Structure 1
Amino acid sequence: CQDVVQDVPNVDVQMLELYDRMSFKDIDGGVWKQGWNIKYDPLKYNAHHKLKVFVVPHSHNDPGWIQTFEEYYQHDTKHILSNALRHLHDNPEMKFIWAEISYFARFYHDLGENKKLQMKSIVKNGQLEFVTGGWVMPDEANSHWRNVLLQLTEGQTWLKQFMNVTPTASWAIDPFGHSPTMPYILQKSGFKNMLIQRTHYSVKKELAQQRQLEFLWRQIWDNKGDTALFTHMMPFYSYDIPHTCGPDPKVCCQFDFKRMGSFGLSCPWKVPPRTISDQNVAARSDLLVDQWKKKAELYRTNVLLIPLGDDFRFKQNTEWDVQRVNYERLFEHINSQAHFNVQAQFGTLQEYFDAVHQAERAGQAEFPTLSGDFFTYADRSDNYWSGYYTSRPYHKRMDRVLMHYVRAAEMLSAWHSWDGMARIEERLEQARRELSLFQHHDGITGTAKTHVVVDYEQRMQEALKACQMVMQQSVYRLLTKPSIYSPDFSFSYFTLDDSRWPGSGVEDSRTTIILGEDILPSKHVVMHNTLPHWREQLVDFYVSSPFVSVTDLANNPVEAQVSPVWSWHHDTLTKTIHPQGSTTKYRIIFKARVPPMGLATYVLTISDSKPEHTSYASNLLLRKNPTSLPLGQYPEDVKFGDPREISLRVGNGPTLAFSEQGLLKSIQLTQDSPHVPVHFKFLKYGVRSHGDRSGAYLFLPNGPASPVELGQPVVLVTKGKLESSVSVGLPSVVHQTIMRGGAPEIRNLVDIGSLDNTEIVMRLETHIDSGDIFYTDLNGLQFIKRRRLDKLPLQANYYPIPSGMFIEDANTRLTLLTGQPLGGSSLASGELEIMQDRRLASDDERGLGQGVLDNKPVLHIYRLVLEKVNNCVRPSKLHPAGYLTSAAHKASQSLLDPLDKFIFAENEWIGAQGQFGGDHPSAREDLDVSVMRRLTKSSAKTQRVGYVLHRTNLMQCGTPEEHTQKLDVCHLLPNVARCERTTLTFLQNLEHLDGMVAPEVCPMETAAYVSSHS
């Protein structure tokens, strides 16, 4: 195993170092506005050294953006694919690349058999080539690596099954900024090459000057380079035709033959394309070849890539003809005129890369190595695309919830083979596809029109219901005596109970367990733990009486706490935000202990009076002018008082102090330690009154944030033996700090209501001497070092916070983990901040054609971990990565993959069992079974189950952390007959494993294994 902490990789380009050195001046470079006037030596190419030019036709098809997926499919994409089939079939030399498999699969299944055969033929023969092959071209900022893998696998599995092809070249021309998580997953999925486009215009200029636009992109901690993937970065402002033939768009636009008038398109530069004829072909070729040779100067080989396409292009037959015929005339002339020393032709993406590597092997070029990322993107001036790190936060949070439900549903149902009548595969396929579709760069990014966001939400809602059905049928089968088990596959044996989605104050969706002497004395509940290690976690349920006690299935009492059910109301009469308590529903909370990848059953029983093992929380409402708050049978009366500072401590955990406005002000780790200043504050950013306006994509603040005026907010303090909390009704946010004995959990119910042109930010102020350094994660996979640059505007210093961020000095670190991707930064030493929601009245000129005014209440969740790190073995000052501690990693897992809770629906569960998985190996804490998926239907004689294993890297800080078992996924199911290591998509076998044992992986590595069972 490579050491990912102590050896700083030596690479030719390290992006953080490059950023420290670059000046980012935005000067007018001439026709290439963000570059310079390229010059070339006409004698560079000659008869023995020609410039090979590959013109690659393409069509960017967004799976939803300004129309829904189905609307685009009906209006445009089905015509594009139908005409691509006809045109490629009839013109053997024409080529075309396709990226979005969600659309291709939709099209293909609707084709008649004769056309399906013609389509397979033009793919088999190389005319139509799939690039990447994912369900979509995903966002790379907000997406979790697990979902990037899910969608890649969804599209590639379909391609292998129906087209018999697996792409090894990736095409990502539109995500807004690029992440090294992509080459990481692709290189472990059989890929050999990738292409990217949206990178800061200053980065394009810098790399073009050094001919470093093609590089071997390795991970920031990779000393040896085994994770390296050849990458091609396009050089210009857009992938459209005007910005892909060369540096001068006024000239390139003349070679987009769809722009002469009849198609309703024209050239902004005021010079239109002209049909190629024998009389103008030499002058036209003169111009085009000169653009090509200038573009070729930016690269190292004599093989040149010229994409030819734009959004939803190649729709009409007439368009296919106008582009193909004109380009064929240009190729015939150019290739026959020796003085140009060029051989041009239509080609595919793979053809381009194969030729580039042939040149490389002939010793024609050596490529630089590079590590780092390409955030935050700016396409021009100060227009940094950091707004979409937060836009439509409700769906960004929904993404993480569905991410977990898909994993749990696939894992719970993988243990058994299911009759087709159970519709398990059917429901899982729908769930994977709707979550995969949302990974699109206009989905999770929050950059689609309102009705499209609604479509993605509805799709995700159906996917969550599909996951619930599969999960509850699985639980019933796993915990019922086999000879008693009698399933109705349409019946709901259990209802899922999720205390954080949609969340209290977002949707009253949770069911109350109704108990009563005259109706039902007890209820079974079951918890699932998808993580491969024993786990304890407090769980809560709503119940109809405060007199309830908990037992496990051996009837051992389990300590529990009952608290009221508090709901906050923006009182339109008193103009205050205050909580109301239920007089008929209560919350029962207790510690569940669940086996690795297992289940544990408990029973809640009512009694006529206070149970021996259940305690009741006290409640204190702080506000002037209080009114009574009755709580039905709840045994402790609510107490009142004027606002005042508060201090709380649960168990032996930290002691937290709060201001009289209910916000954290300090954390004391142990009884004797200092009360470390850690203050939460809410602020607001506005929009510029002159100049460019912020919108769904762009964050263009009118200066640093201003504090939100708090007034005299109502603060609710609930103190219990197992859980305490301080909640406060702030304008636009009910902020809650929850304590259960470790790092607190923070929940924000964010309702920006009608506050136009406002972005609400949550900031932490500490005295940690972090200076200009902070860390944020990339796709929940790795933490990368960031350096605040005052030479760049505020919005350029915002980065994606897909799952966590932290600041530290020599002794202290503060880490904020998230349950949803949002944008954030550290704008001053000792600070961390993360945007909660943004409501923007204006469109930001990127094509969406609307502002963001469809905000809805969202419950954002976090864990806040303050720790001493002076004893931790950290990377050196020059290392570009950072790593979490064990506590911070477990806190992240508590947010993204909590225990799942199931409530038995009927009155009696006959044949119920108390536990499942007690014999599953409890793996080391840094190892996770990211995916467990049965790959075969029940009719397969040989069953196959796939596993994706990921080991993160946690800092060594002096904790002995011992006793754990080796996890061999190939022996999790009985009767194993074969164990193979495969690509991460499970599509290719890489290694036949000895003894059918799957070796665990190294820190920061991810491997996939498939076990076969007889």
Structure 2
Amino acid sequence: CQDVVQDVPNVDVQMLELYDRMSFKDIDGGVWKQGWNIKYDPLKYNAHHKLKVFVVPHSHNDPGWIQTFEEYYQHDTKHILSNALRHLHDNPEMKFIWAEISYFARFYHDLGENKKLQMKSIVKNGQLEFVTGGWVMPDEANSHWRNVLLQLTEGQTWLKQFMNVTPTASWAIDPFGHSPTMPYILQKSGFKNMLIQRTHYSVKKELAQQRQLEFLWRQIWDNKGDTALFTHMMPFYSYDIPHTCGPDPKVCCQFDFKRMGSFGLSCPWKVPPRTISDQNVAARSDLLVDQWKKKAELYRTNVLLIPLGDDFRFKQNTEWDVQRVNYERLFEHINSQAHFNVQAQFGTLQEYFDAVHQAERAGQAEFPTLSGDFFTYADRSDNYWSGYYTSRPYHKRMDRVLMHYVRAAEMLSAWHSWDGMARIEERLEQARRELSLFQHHDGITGTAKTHVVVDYEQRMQEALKACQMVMQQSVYRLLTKPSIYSPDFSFSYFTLDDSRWPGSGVEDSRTTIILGEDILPSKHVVMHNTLPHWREQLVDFYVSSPFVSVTDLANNPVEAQVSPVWSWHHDTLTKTIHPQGSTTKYRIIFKARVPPMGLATYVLTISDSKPEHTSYASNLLLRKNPTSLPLGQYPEDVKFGDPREISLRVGNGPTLAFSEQGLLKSIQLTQDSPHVPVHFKFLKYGVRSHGDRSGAYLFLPNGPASPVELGQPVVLVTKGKLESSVSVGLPSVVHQTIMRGGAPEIRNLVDIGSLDNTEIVMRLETHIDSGDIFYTDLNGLQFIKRRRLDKLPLQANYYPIPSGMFIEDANTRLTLLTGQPLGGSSLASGELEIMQDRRLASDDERGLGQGVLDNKPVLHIYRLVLEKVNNCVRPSKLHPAGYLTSAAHKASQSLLDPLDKFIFAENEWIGAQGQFGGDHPSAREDLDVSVMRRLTKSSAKTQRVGYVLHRTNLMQCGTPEEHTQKLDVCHLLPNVARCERTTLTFLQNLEHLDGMVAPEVCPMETAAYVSSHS
């Protein structure tokens, strides 16, 4: 195993280093506005060394953006695919690449058999080529790597099955900035090449000047280079035709033959395309070839990529003809005119890369190595696309919830083979596809029109319901005596209970477990732990009486705490934000202990009075002018007081001090250690009154954020033996700090309401001497070092915070983990900040045609980890990565993959069992079974189950290792006949494993295994 901490990779281009050096001046470079006038030596190409040009037709089809997926499919995409089928069938030399399999699968399934055969034929013969082959072309900033893999697999499994092809070249022309997470997954999924387009214009300029637009992109910690994936970065401002034939859009526009009038399109540079004829073909070729040779100067081989396409192009048959015929006249003239020394033709993406590598292999070029990412993207001037790291945060949070439900559903149902009648496969496929669809770069990015966002939400909601059905049928089967198990596949044996989604104050969706001597004395509940190690976590349930005790299935008492159910109300009469306690339902909380990838059953029983093992939290409402807060049968009276500073400590955990406004001000790790200054503060960014406006994409603040005026907020303090909390009703945010004995959990119920042109940010102020350094993660896969650059505007120093961020000095680190992707930064030494929501009245000119005025209440969750790191073995100062500690990593897992909770829905569960998986291996803490998915239906003689195993890398800080067993996923199910290591999509077998044993992987590595069972 490579050491991912101590050896700094030596690469030709390291993006953080490059950023530190570049000036980013936005100078008018002439026709190539963000470059310079490219010059070339006409003698470079000659009879013995021609410029081979591949014109690659394409059509960017967004699976929802300004229309929904189905509206685009009906209005555009099915026509584009129907016409591509016909035109390619009829013109053997024409080529076309297709990226979005969600649309392709939708189309293909609707085709009659004759057409399906024709389609398979033009794919088999090389005319229609799939690039990437994912369900979508995902966002690369907010997406979790697990979902990026899911959607890649969903599209590629479909392609393998129906088209019998697996793309090895990736095409990503529209995500707003690019992540090294893509080559990481692609290279482990059989890919050999990839292409990206939206990178900062200064980066394009800089790499173009060094002919570093093509590089072997390896991971920032990869010293050896085995993660390397050849990457082609396009040079220009857009993937449209004006910006893909060469440096001068005014000339390239003349070669987009769809811009002539009848199609309603034209060239904004005022020179229109002209039909090619024998009389103008030489002059038109003179121009075009000159653009091609200029573009070629930016690369190292004699093979040139010329994308030919734009959004939803190649729709009309007349469009296919006008593009094809004119280009064919150009090629016939150009290839027969020796003085150009060019051979041009239509080609596919793979053809381009194959030829590039043939040149490489002929020793014609050597490519630079590169590590780093391509955030935050700016397409021009100071228009940095960091706004979408936060836009529509409700759905960004919903993405992580569904991410986990899909994993839990596939995992829980994987243990058994299911009769087709149970419709397990059907529900899982729907869930995977709706979550996969949302990975689209107008999905989770929050950059779609309002009615499209609604479509994605509805799709995700049905996916959540599908996961729940599968999960609950699976639990019932796993914990019921086999000879008693009598499933009704449409029956709800259990109701899932989720305490954080939609979340208290977002939706009253949790069921109350109703107990009573005259109706039901007790209720079984079950917890599932998708993580491959024994895990304890507090869980809570609403119950109709505060007098409830908990026992496990051996009937041992489990210590529990009951607290009131508090809801905050923006009281439009008193004009205050204050809490009301339920007088009919209460929260019972207890520590569940659950086996690795397993289940544990508990029982909640009512009694007429306080049970022996249940304690009650005290509650204190701090505000001037209080009124009574009755809590029905709750046994402890609420106390009142004027606002004041308070301190709390749960268990042996840290002691936290809060200001009289209910906000954290310090953390004391142990009883005599210092009260470390850690202050939460909420601020607001506005929008510029002149100049460019922030929108769904762009963050264009009118200066540093200003503090939210808090007034004298109502602060509620609940103190219990297992869980205490401090909640405060601030304008737009009910901010809650929850303590359970370790790092606190922070929850913000964010309702930006009607505050127009406002972005609410949550900032942490500490005295950590972090200087200009901070770390943020990329797709929940790795942490990359960021350096705040004052030579760039504030919005450029904002980065995606998909799952966590931290600052540290030599001795102390503060890590903020998130249950949802949001944008954030460290704008000053000792600070961390992360945007909560943003509401913008204006469109920001990237085509969306609206601002963001559809905000809705969202419950953001976090874990805040203050730690000493002076004893941790950290990377050197020059290393571009950072790594979590055991505690921060576990804190991230508690947000992304909490225990799942199930309430038995009927009065009595006959044949109930207490636990499942007590014999599953409890693997080392840095290892995760990211995916467990049965790959065969029940009628398959040889059953196959796929596993994706990921090991992160945690810092060694002096804590002795301890126990753990080796996890061999191939022996998790019985009767194993074969164990194979495979690509991450499970589509290709890479290694037959001796003894049918699946080895664990190395730190930061990810492997996929498939076990076959007789």
TM (norm. structure 1) is: 1.00
Q: Which whole-Å CA distance do the structure 2 matches of 1:620 and 1:286 have between them?
A: 81
Secondary structure at the aligned position of 2:258 is classed as helix
Q: Which whole-Å CA distance do the structure 1 matches of 2:596 and 2:250 have between them?
A: 62
Deviation at 1:915, TM superposition (A): 0.2
Deviation at 1:865, TM superposition (A): 0.2
Secondary structure at the aligned position of 2:148 is classed as helix
Q: Which whole-Å CA distance do the structure 2 matches of 1:316 and 1:548 have between them?
A: 68
Deviation at 1:59, TM superposition (A): 0.2
Deviation at 1:196, TM superposition (A): 0.2
Q: Which whole-Å CA distance do the structure 1 matches of 2:227 and 2:300 have between them?
A: 22
Q: Which whole-Å CA distance do the structure 2 matches of 1:38 and 1:478 have between them?
A: 67
Deviation at 1:688, TM superposition (A): 0.2
> 2:176 is matched with which residue?
176
> 1:824 is matched with which residue?
824
Secondary structure at the aligned position of 1:102 is classed as helix
Q: Which whole-Å CA distance do the structure 1 matches of 2:900 and 2:284 have between them?
A: 65
Secondary structure at the aligned position of 1:194 is classed as strand
Q: Which whole-Å CA distance do the structure 1 matches of 2:279 and 2:660 have between them?
A: 83
Alpha-carbon displacement from aligned partner over 1:452-484 (angstroms, at most 9, x marks no partner): 000000000000000000000000000000000
Secondary structure at the aligned position of 1:1010 is classed as strand
Q: Which whole-Å CA distance do the structure 1 matches of 2:961 and 2:805 have between them?
A: 24
Q: Which whole-Å CA distance do the structure 1 matches of 2:51 and 2:652 have between them?
A: 71
Alpha-carbon displacement from aligned partner over 1:119-144 (angstroms, at most 9, x marks no partner): 00000000000000000000000000
> 2:555 is matched with which residue?
555
Q: Which whole-Å CA distance do the structure 1 matches of 2:267 and 2:306 have between them?
A: 19
Alpha-carbon displacement from aligned partner over 1:721-742 (angstroms, at most 9, x marks no partner): 0000000000000000000000
> 2:1007 is matched with which residue?
1007
Secondary structure at the aligned position of 2:604 is classed as strand
Deviation at 1:556, TM superposition (A): 0.3
Q: Which whole-Å CA distance do the structure 1 matches of 2:572 and 2:671 have between them?
A: 44
Q: Which whole-Å CA distance do the structure 2 matches of 1:657 and 1:961 have between them?
A: 32
Deviation at 1:594, TM superposition (A): 0.2
Q: Which whole-Å CA distance do the structure 2 matches of 1:547 and 1:46 have between them?
A: 90
Alpha-carbon displacement from aligned partner over 1:320-376 (angstroms, at most 9, x marks no partner): 000000000000000000000000000000000000000000000000000000000
Q: Which whole-Å CA distance do the structure 2 matches of 1:567 and 1:249 have between them?
A: 57
Alpha-carbon displacement from aligned partner over 1:556-597 (angstroms, at most 9, x marks no partner): 000000000000000000000000000110000000000000
Deviation at 1:962, TM superposition (A): 0.8
> 1:798 is matched with which residue?
798
> 1:537 is matched with which residue?
537
Deviation at 1:492, TM superposition (A): 0.1
Deviation at 1:186, TM superposition (A): 0.1
Q: Which whole-Å CA distance do the structure 1 matches of 2:245 and 2:568 have between them?
A: 59
Secondary structure at the aligned position of 1:272 is classed as coil
Q: Which whole-Å CA distance do the structure 1 matches of 2:911 and 2:280 have between them?
A: 85
Alpha-carbon displacement from aligned partner over 1:864-900 (angstroms, at most 9, x marks no partner): 0000000000000000000000000000000000000
Deviation at 1:101, TM superposition (A): 0.1
Alpha-carbon displacement from aligned partner over 1:536-560 (angstroms, at most 9, x marks no partner): 0000000000000000000000000
Alpha-carbon displacement from aligned partner over 1:170-205 (angstroms, at most 9, x marks no partner): 000000000000000000000000000000000000
Alpha-carbon displacement from aligned partner over 1:401-451 (angstroms, at most 9, x marks no partner): 000000000000000000000000000000000000000000000000000
Q: Which whole-Å CA distance do the structure 2 matches of 1:763 and 1:475 have between them?
A: 41
> 2:493 is matched with which residue?
493
Q: Which whole-Å CA distance do the structure 2 matches of 1:244 and 1:629 have between them?
A: 67
Q: Which whole-Å CA distance do the structure 1 matches of 2:272 and 2:122 have between them?
A: 33
Q: Which whole-Å CA distance do the structure 2 matches of 1:653 and 1:249 have between them?
A: 62
Secondary structure at the aligned position of 1:763 is classed as strand
Deviation at 1:1001, TM superposition (A): 0.2
Unaligned runs of 5+ in 1: none
> 1:73 is matched with which residue?
73
Q: Which whole-Å CA distance do the structure 1 matches of 2:771 and 2:370 have between them?
A: 26
Residue correspondence of structure 1 range 983-1002 to structure 2 within 5 A: 983-1002=983-1002
Secondary structure at the aligned position of 2:263 is classed as coil
Deviation at 1:652, TM superposition (A): 0.3
RMSD of equivalent CA atoms: 0.2
Deviation at 1:263, TM superposition (A): 0.3
Matched, 1:221 2:221: yes
Deviation at 1:983, TM superposition (A): 0.1
Q: Which whole-Å CA distance do the structure 2 matches of 1:687 and 1:129 have between them?
A: 44
Residue correspondence of structure 1 range 379-390 to structure 2 within 5 A: 379-390=379-390
Q: Which whole-Å CA distance do the structure 2 matches of 1:963 and 1:465 have between them?
A: 38
Secondary structure at the aligned position of 1:817 is classed as strand
Q: Which whole-Å CA distance do the structure 1 matches of 2:896 and 2:244 have between them?
A: 41
Q: Which whole-Å CA distance do the structure 2 matches of 1:753 and 1:282 have between them?
A: 62
Q: Which whole-Å CA distance do the structure 2 matches of 1:513 and 1:262 have between them?
A: 65
> 1:926 is matched with which residue?
926
Q: Which whole-Å CA distance do the structure 2 matches of 1:778 and 1:134 have between them?
A: 19
Q: Which whole-Å CA distance do the structure 2 matches of 1:340 and 1:810 have between them?
A: 61
> 2:503 is matched with which residue?
503
Alpha-carbon displacement from aligned partner over 1:687-706 (angstroms, at most 9, x marks no partner): 00000000000000000000
> 2:131 is matched with which residue?
131
Unaligned runs of 5+ in 2: none
Alpha-carbon displacement from aligned partner over 1:805-861 (angstroms, at most 9, x marks no partner): 000000000000000000000000000000000000000000000000000000000
Deviation at 1:649, TM superposition (A): 0.2
Deviation at 1:961, TM superposition (A): 2.3
Q: Which whole-Å CA distance do the structure 2 matches of 1:597 and 1:976 have between them?
A: 19
Alpha-carbon displacement from aligned partner over 1:266-302 (angstroms, at most 9, x marks no partner): 0000000000000000000000000000000000000
User: How high is the sequence identity, in percent, across the aligned residues?
Assistant: 100
Alpha-carbon displacement from aligned partner over 1:70-109 (angstroms, at most 9, x marks no partner): 0000000000000000000000000000000000000000
> 2:452 is matched with which residue?
452
Q: Which whole-Å CA distance do the structure 1 matches of 2:162 and 2:276 have between them?
A: 39
Deviation at 1:682, TM superposition (A): 0.1
Q: Which whole-Å CA distance do the structure 2 matches of 1:298 and 1:444 have between them?
A: 34
Deviation at 1:676, TM superposition (A): 0.3
Alpha-carbon displacement from aligned partner over 1:489-544 (angstroms, at most 9, x marks no partner): 00000000000000000000000000000000000000000000000000000000
Secondary structure at the aligned position of 1:288 is classed as helix
Residue correspondence of structure 1 range 471-870 to structure 2 within 5 A: 471-870=471-870
Secondary structure at the aligned position of 1:133 is classed as coil
Secondary structure at the aligned position of 2:700 is classed as coil
Deviation at 1:993, TM superposition (A): 0.2
Q: Which whole-Å CA distance do the structure 2 matches of 1:831 and 1:600 have between them?
A: 41
Q: Which whole-Å CA distance do the structure 2 matches of 1:57 and 1:16 have between them?
A: 35
Q: Which whole-Å CA distance do the structure 2 matches of 1:259 and 1:632 have between them?
A: 72
Q: Which whole-Å CA distance do the structure 1 matches of 2:335 and 2:656 have between them?
A: 75
Q: Which whole-Å CA distance do the structure 2 matches of 1:840 and 1:104 have between them?
A: 35
Deviation at 1:160, TM superposition (A): 0.2
Secondary structure at the aligned position of 1:257 is classed as coil
Deviation at 1:965, TM superposition (A): 0.3
Q: Which whole-Å CA distance do the structure 2 matches of 1:674 and 1:121 have between them?
A: 72
Residue correspondence of structure 1 range 73-472 to structure 2 within 5 A: 73-472=73-472
Secondary structure at the aligned position of 1:104 is classed as helix
Deviation at 1:1010, TM superposition (A): 0.2
Deviation at 1:646, TM superposition (A): 0.2
Secondary structure at the aligned position of 2:429 is classed as helix
Secondary structure at the aligned position of 1:957 is classed as coil
Alpha-carbon displacement from aligned partner over 1:199-230 (angstroms, at most 9, x marks no partner): 00000000000000000000000000000000
Q: Which whole-Å CA distance do the structure 2 matches of 1:913 and 1:471 have between them?
A: 17
Q: Which whole-Å CA distance do the structure 1 matches of 2:318 and 2:201 have between them?
A: 35
Q: Which whole-Å CA distance do the structure 2 matches of 1:616 and 1:242 have between them?
A: 69
Q: Which whole-Å CA distance do the structure 2 matches of 1:280 and 1:760 have between them?
A: 58
Alpha-carbon displacement from aligned partner over 1:366-413 (angstroms, at most 9, x marks no partner): 000000000000000000000000000000000000000000000000
TM (norm. structure 2) is: 1.00
Secondary structure at the aligned position of 1:258 is classed as coil
Alpha-carbon displacement from aligned partner over 1:753-781 (angstroms, at most 9, x marks no partner): 00000000000000000000000000000
